[PDB]
Amino acid sequence: ISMKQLLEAGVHFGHQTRRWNPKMKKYIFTERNGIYIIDLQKTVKLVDAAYDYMKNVAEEGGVALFVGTKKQAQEAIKDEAIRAGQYYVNHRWLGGTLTNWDTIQKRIARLKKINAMEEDGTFEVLPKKEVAGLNKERERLEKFLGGIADMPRIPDVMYIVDPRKERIAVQEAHKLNIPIVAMVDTNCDPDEIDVVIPSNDDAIRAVKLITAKMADAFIEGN
RNA sequence: CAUGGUUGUCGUCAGCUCGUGUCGUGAGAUGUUGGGUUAAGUCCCGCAACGAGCGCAACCCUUAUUGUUAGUUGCCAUCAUU
Numbered sequence: 001i002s003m004k005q006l007l008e009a010g011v012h013f014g015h016q017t018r019r020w021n022p023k024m025k026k027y028i029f030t031e032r033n034g035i036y037i038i039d040l041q042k043t044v045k046l047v048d049a050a051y052d053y054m055k056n057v058a059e060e061g062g063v064a065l066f067v068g069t070k071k072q073a074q075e076a077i078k079d080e081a082i083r084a085g086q087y088y089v090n091h092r093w094l095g096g097t098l099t100n101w102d103t104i105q106k107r108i109a110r111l112k113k114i115n116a117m118e119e120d121g122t123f124e125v126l127p128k129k130e131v132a133g134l135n136k137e138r139e140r141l142e143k144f145l146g147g148i149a150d151m152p153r154i155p156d157v158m159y160i161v162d163p164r165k166e167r168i169a170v171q172e173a174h175k176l177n178i179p180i181v182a183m184v185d186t187n188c189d190p191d192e193i194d195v196v197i198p199s200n201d202d203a204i205r206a207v208k209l210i211t212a213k214m215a216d217a218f219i220e221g222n
Numbered sequence: 223c224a225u226g227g228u229u230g231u232c233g234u235c236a237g238c239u240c241g242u243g244u245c246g247u248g249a250g251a252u253g254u255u256g257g258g259u260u261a262a263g264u265c266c267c268g269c270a271a272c273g274a275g276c277g278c279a280a281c282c283c284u285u286a287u288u289g290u291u292a293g294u295u296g297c298c299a300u301c302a303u304u
């Protein structure tokens with residue numbers, strides 16, 4: 001991967017000063033007009049590193065779970081997850097998604113049941129007022145649990161856009177000894193992450209670029 | 223004031239709990255709170271929680287209009303007679 005690609009994506013931009021976590025001085029290059037800038041050679045080296053690591057994961061056959069919920073990532077991450085065949089989250093992370101897997105699996109079964117009845121069963125016995133509520137239940141379940149339906153087990157790696165916004169899944173991975181890849185920025189904590197990738201939080205192009213490299217990592221490990 | 227069973231009340235007010243998970247040294251919190259809404263934790267949206275049960279509501283009775291089947295011990299318009 002190049003550096004001009006990163007520049008075109010706008011990766012080198014971070015958040016304003018006053019939110020600047022000092023742990024990321026390891027990766028801050030400078031600031032421009034009052035906004036800190038990320039060290040791009042180090043960023044490229046870390047990108048290639050994480051690419052190799054996640055390729056090793058997909059070669060060994062582990063499972064991968066993506067996370068992005070803000071306005072700027074919840075479509076590109078879905079795109080690349082569907083490309084790679086690995087699972088994803090595009091809306092609110094459910095507290096207990098992994099720690100309470102045995103309970104969440106019941107609601108996944110409920111989703112499968114509603115689908116198999118309405119569309120594979122095609123029963124239409126019960127009336128309109130009830131089936132409408134059922135369809136809205138299906139809508140919510142597809143909104144939240146839609147990305148982890150057939151995911152057979154907990155992941156062996158969790159790719160995340162923003163750890164501050166996704167403070168829950170980070171903590172769940174910590175509880176479960178699950179490794180984290182992260183699009184860290186100039187306000188987040190890297191010490192909560194096993195494989196850091198410096199980046200910007202608010203660049204659709206950047207998110208698509210990095211997530212495309214991860215999807216390529218998986219497809220080229222398999 | 224040994225008990226069962228039965229019952230009154232708070233109160234037909236809408237609240238009380240649980241499993242799993244998370245947070246808290248812990249007791250405990252969360253869920254059950256927040257924005258609206260409802261007669262109602264009723265419903266939705268949101269959220270470190272997901273859900274579920276008891277309850278609410280509904281399924282029940284009666285009244286409120288009416289189709290059909292039935293027409294005596296009930297009823298009398300079309301008719302004649304008391």
